[PDB]
Amino acid sequence: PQITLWKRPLVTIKIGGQLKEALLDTGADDTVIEEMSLPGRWKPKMIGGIGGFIKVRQYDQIIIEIAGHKAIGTVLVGPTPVNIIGRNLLTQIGATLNF
Amino acid sequence: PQITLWKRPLVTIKIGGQLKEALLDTGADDTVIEEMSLPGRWKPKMIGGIGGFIKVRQYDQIIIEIAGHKAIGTVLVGPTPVNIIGRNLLTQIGATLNF
Numbered sequence A, B: 001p002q003i004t005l006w007k008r009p010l011v012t013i014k015i016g017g018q019l020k021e022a023l024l025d026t027g028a029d030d031t032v033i034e035e036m037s038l039p040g041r042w043k044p045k046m047i048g049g050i051g052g053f054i055k056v057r058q059y060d061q062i063i064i065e066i067a068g069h070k071a072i073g074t075v076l077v078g079p080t081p082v083n084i085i086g087r088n089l090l091t092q093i094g095a096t097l098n099f
């Protein structure tokens, strides 16, 4: 699809067996999801943005379905105010910015 | 252009006659730039990001060139970690996300 940017580019995702709304975010290096449980190993990480840093759990090799497209990669889990799909998974679904 | 997301989608912008680097950010509603001098009056605005809220200065109807495309609109100035081009100006340059 082609998503215009008049409105937030929100899509439905499936992660950890749950459906969630997430923002397709080209200004995010990494994917960050609100608190939830994921299977396997994780390690702590700090990530920063406007407002400063938050502590997150880093899970690697997680499958996510993004608007119907399956991708695998690292997912950060922590107290983010919005679920964000960052470049590490946007690349896997072939997303590009065009103008 | 068609911009992939394997690296940060950084572009050159021109504002106040200065060249700067900025991030095309579909996750940002608004454009936020690091501290600089802009003409005219400003208005207060509180913006929230991943680590919390910051106060910024809101300047309206500012001329800004973005990867060679002319835009005129609102620019927020404040302690952002990186210059961010948000949806308010990505729509002015015709940008869309595609996959």
Ligand SMILES: CCN[C@H]1CO[C@@H]2OCC[C@H](OC(=O)N[C@@H](Cc3ccccc3)[C@H](O)CN(CC(C)C)S(=O)(=O)c3ccc(OC)cc3)[C@@H]21
Pocket (backbone or CB within 6 Å): A023, A025, A026, A027, A028, A029, A030, A031, A032, A047, A048, A049, A050, A081, A082, A084, A086, B025, B026, B027, B028, B029, B030, B031, B032, B047, B048, B049, B050, B051, B082, B084, B086
């Ligand atoms: C209330 C919403 N206002 C937000 C919405 O737009 C507003 O205007 C612009 C400034 C602020 O927007 C954001 O902070 N946008 C966030 C994504 C984001 C969206 C919503 C809430 C929080 C974050 C960005 O798209 C991605 N951010 C990075 C950029 C600030 C460089 S980030 O979420 O902090 C980030 C993500 C992954 C990551 O891995 C290393 C590291 C950092 C305001």
Ligand SMILES: [Cl-]
Pocket (backbone or CB within 6 Å): A072, A073, A074, A088, A089
């Ligand atoms: Cl990854």
Ligand SMILES: [Cl-]
Pocket (backbone or CB within 6 Å): A094, B004
């Ligand atoms: Cl590619």
Ligand SMILES: [Cl-]
Pocket (backbone or CB within 6 Å): B072, B073, B074, B088, B089
């Ligand atoms: Cl505007």
Ligand code: NA
Pocket (backbone or CB within 6 Å): A039, A040, A041, A059, A060, A061, A062
């Ligand atoms: Na894992």
